[PDB]
Amino acid sequence: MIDKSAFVHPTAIVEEGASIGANAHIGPFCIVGPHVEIGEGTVLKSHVVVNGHTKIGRDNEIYQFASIGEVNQDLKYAGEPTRVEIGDRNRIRESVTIHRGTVQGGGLTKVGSDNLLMINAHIAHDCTVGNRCILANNATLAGHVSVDDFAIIGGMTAVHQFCIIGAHVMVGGCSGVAQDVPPYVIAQGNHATPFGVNIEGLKRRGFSREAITAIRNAYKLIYRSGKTLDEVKPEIAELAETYPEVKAFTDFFARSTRGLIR
Template sequence: MKMIAASARVHPLAVVEDGAVIGENVVVGPFCYVGPKVVLHDDVELLQHAVVTGRTVIGRGCRFFPNSVVGGDPQSLHHDGAETTLTVGEKCTFREGVTVNTGTTDGGGKTVIGNNNLFLANSHVAHDCILGDHIVMSNNVLLAGHVIVEDRVILGGGSAVHQFTRIGRQAFIGGLSAVSYDVIPYGMLNGNPGLLSGLNVVGMSRAGIEKATIHEVRRAYKQIFEGEGSIRANAAAIRDDYAGSAPVMQILDFIAAESDRALSSPHRGSKG
């Protein structure tokens, strides 16, 4: 049985399967499809030809533009067909042709997207990705499986991210870049293969980070990537010096964390 709130508006040419849960003030436009295990929270809007399927929960105020397909099965040869999930936070926008897949059984079984994210036309979020808040994925951005993208990251048009890669908070990925290795918080990466080209100073300033703190981060960046030792050894060596700087500590913690990928650096080969 469908559970459709009284204030919801479902176009007569839309298909809402039995079992779907439709919240208050939801709009489902013509030729849309809502699967039987979908939950649309209040104020969600599906424009014509949008599809939400799978075991998918959509947060309040999200918008889906024509031909977006969210909650489809993972595109993985290893998926055994078991039921997995997709969870989307509040006020996310999925423009034309965006695709987002549910998780895989061997990858944790869930894809998770936070709040206030913008997915521009034809971008793709693969299985088991974990995304934070206030992320912008420009047109044709591709995330492979198991990618982690932290808060306020911007990915330029046509960039592609290798599976199991992490992108730290407020990093900036240039258009058409190939992201093969982890990108530190506040880092700026460009090219194919992608190399660090400094820090996202503009983004840091817009976020209200003080100039003195930005200078600290710049100094730490040089010590990490231009020091004589390996990246991880250099990062560990300066930890005590920057204990009072939250942004620097975020970078150092990111570098110290376990990962399936190497670290992006300003050089062609990472020093590890």
């Protein structure tokens, strides 16, 4: 149902079954499918397509020519009723594409809250994007990719299937990310390699001097010590006992399937 306080432009097409929240705005020439839920205060500016089994949160701003919930590009996909979930206060810019999941990948593409998805950013099937992320122009997440909180992905960067971009990571523009990026790391190149800790990001987000030093020490264990990952894991866990910010490494290691960028 369409809330009495929602605005639906006369030229927009909202299919019977769609749920449109209070003070939402469906602009001219938008198409909203029957399995779509659009939350309170969310704005579709104009020329937006939203379809599939798709739930969108509150106070989002979705710009013209975006395609949200659409059939994904996986050749294995066969029309199964998979899903998209998008949180609150996202800015989803012109020509952004966010595709529905595949059964094989878990059935769900998920985006958190307070993200900025810049022009032509692509979120393929089965991706999970956290909160407070930035995907710059033409940033492309291939299928099954995870982008953790606060991560920034530079212009024209592609993240290969199944890779994890850790929390507070900075990926430089025109990069190709072929393996997992630990949290707090600056990554650049094709294939992408590590270039130290994202110190400025940590500063801006209220990390203490002690936390930043500990994170740098963990980085050094992984990349400077000359030891294998299996050797340094307990050392990092040991370090995390004093500085809890370091636990992000541990949690990331447990999820990592493609090995670390080096």
